[PDB]
Amino acid sequence: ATQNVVFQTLATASGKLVGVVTLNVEKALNALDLDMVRAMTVQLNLWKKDPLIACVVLDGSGEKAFCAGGDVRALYHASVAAKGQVTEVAKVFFEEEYRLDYLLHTYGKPVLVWGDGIVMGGGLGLMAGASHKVVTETSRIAMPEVTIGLYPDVGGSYFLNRMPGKMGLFLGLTAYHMNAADACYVGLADHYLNRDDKELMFDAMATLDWSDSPALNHQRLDTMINELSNQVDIPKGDSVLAESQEMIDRLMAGSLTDIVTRMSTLSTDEAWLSKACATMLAGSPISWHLAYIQTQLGTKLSLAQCFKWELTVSVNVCAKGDFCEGVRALLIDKDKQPKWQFADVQSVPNSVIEDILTSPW
């Protein structure tokens, strides 16, 4: 098997079991790779149909991260080799990760994610579907795909559009680092604890009155977290995003052209907002188009339809987008000097975007 993800069951006073998944590459901040994706889908699928299993928990080894993103190394390398040609490596990577995220949203039984610390990219993808999304004083959550020439995938096509006003667009453009307050506000988190409550949360699961009804167990699990939640020693405080909603709807209004001019035009003494600007403006112009097109998708598509659309775009940006230069600059060569295939927003030819949107199958 793989050692990068580990499974065990927590026994409970009721006789039911809680299945616990632990991502285990503390070295790479629990970065999600395909072996993990396979072992997890294999074990989750077994657990889903097992009547002893009442609930599933996802968490990550060490203190720093639940999961900081996908491991895009082997995807970077395959992609470059084939040089403008879609690859089975990509197809397999995305298809299978997306099946995993999908399985998590429609799990039936509760899935609790211990979203303490860093949760980004693919990591955010594992979390975003869960029924019981837990964050802590240390949670930092983001989709930085735009900085490496991808876009906010792993179901973002579905979840981003469902957030207040233009929030999902801003998050995808800017790779804004949300805290626990921010994550609750936008609906990426359901519950707030503190890190040093992990032990008590597991104690409480062992003694929870687990039943044979998924929906009742959902309710009991919320109530359960709810009580531990009044007892946090460190408050989540205020959401910067929530307090800036109207200003963020303004900055994100109109066409992508307005936004890019607005963003590159603004000055502000708000550190959070000026790094957001600078992060957006340094990322892939192709990425800005993709994030922006996602918002035109509206909310009609089912979850499964968003993933199908993403498998197409992801597979195509790796081949023809800025992703390879992105991953060369931040990850392999580490000079963080991307030279993007196109310079600015206008320069990305519409026939490039259109090709990226079209099924290579």
From TrEMBL:
Residues passing through the membrane, by range: none
Look up the domain of life of the source.
Bacteria
Gene Ontology annotations of biological process type: L-valine catabolic process
Alphabetized SUPFAM superfamilies for the sequence: ClpP/crotonase
In terms of InterPro entries, this protein maps to:
ClpP/crotonase-like_dom_sf, ECH_dom, HIBYL-CoA-H
Q: Recorded E.C. number(s)? A: 3.1.2.4
Keywords in UniProt for this one? Answer: Hydrolase
- Please name the Pfam families in this protein's record: ECH_2 (PF16113)
Single GO term (MF): 3-hydroxyisobutyryl-CoA hydrolase activity
List the catalytic activities from the record: 3-hydroxy-2-methylpropanoyl-CoA + H2O = 3-hydroxy-2-methylpropanoate + CoA + H(+)
This protein's record includes keyword Hydrolase: yes
Enoyl-CoA hydratase/isomerase domain sequence ranges: 18-356
Keyword Nucleotide-binding annotated:
no
Query: Know the name of this protein?
Result: 3-hydroxyisobutyryl-CoA hydrolase
List the top taxonomic levels of the source.
Bacteria, Pseudomonadati, Pseudomonadota, Gammaproteobacteria, Alteromonadales
